[PDB]
Design a protein around this ligand. Structure first.
Ligand SMILES: Nc1cncc(Cl)n1
Length: 283
């Protein structure tokens, strides 16, 4: 669009290309997202406009929505790095625990806010968690999945065909990201839906009616699933301490009604000693 000078292709997102651009009437540097045709659905336009009001320090600001020439562009605040690259950058040492804790705490604050207004992300992953030089982390693309690819962070209720899923799906994803920050490997790197489900089962045990009432009646559940025994969390995420492991287990409860809420996770003892360190980042 005419008011924006693209400076660089930053990536191919879920919905289209993401550019770093500069606005000419403000001089502001932004992330420009092209979405994707019938002439942009009217409901998607209405959903997106609700998102313009969903403002929080831990949510990447939706600056503008440009519906022009029957195309849709989302203009976001720009951040220089994402958690995926920072994790790759931090592979030999690992992200220090104080920083992991600060990031998780801030992300939960973001989720708690969105969840309080009944907005889910649905597709959390390291690539859409954006970090700055101030030690802040922010959720990008919040609300876009409902308004409009890796399986690694997808909740089991989604994999099992539950169509009416809750905010709990975001808590699952963030637990997976938390484990990954700690161990420097992805928790459940599935490369198909069955492989994702079966990786989850191999670590947390195949779910049954005892841990997850109603599970065997879910659309894609099969009596023929193999029955793996649950592994111990001390084997899954060493050398995370007892507080972190305790929290992680609650974030990874099979039953979405049992799974910890963002708001209850913020009160967890793990965060008793949270701080806000600044990361070392080269831009
Ligand atoms: N890659 C980027 C940078 N800033 C904001 C967004 Cl939404 N994406």
């Amino acid at each position: 669009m005419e008011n924006f000078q693209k400076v660089e292709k930053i990536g191919e997102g879920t919905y289209g290309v993401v550019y770093k651009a500069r606005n000419k009437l403000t001089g502001e540097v932004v992330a420009l997202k092209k979405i994707r045709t019938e002439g942009v659905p009217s409901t998607a336009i209405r959903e997106i406009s609700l998102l313009k009001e969903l403002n929080h320090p831990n949510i990447v600001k939706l600056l503008d929505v440009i519906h022009t020439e029957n195309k849709l562009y989302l203009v976001f605040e720009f951040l220089h790095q994402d958690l995926k690259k920072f994790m790759d950058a931090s592979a030999l040492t690992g992200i220090p625990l104080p920083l992991i804790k600060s990031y998780l705490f801030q992300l939960l604050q973001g989720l708690a806010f969105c969840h309080s207004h009944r907005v889910l992300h649905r597709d959390l992953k390291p690539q859409n968690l954006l970090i700055n030089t101030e030690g802040a982390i922010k959720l990008a693309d919040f609300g876009l999945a409902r308004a409009f690819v890796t399986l690694w962070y997808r909740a089991p209720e989604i994999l099992l065909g539950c169509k009416y899923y809750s905010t709990a799906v975001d808590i699952w994803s963030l637990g997976c990201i938390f484990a990954e920050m700690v161990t420097r490997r992805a928790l459940f790197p599935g490369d198909s839906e069955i492989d994702q489900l079966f990786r989850i089962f191999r670590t947390l045990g195949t779910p049954d009616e005892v841990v997850w009432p109603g599970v065997t009646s879910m659309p894609d559940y099969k009596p023929s699933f193999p029955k793996w025994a649950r592994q111990d969390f001390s084997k899954v995420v060493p050398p995370l301490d007892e507080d972190g492991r305790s929290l992680l287990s609650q974030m990874l409860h099979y039953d979405p009604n049992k799974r910890i809420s963002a708001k209850a996770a913020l009160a967890h003892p793990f965060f008793q000693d949270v701080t806000k360190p600044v990361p070392h980042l080269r831009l």
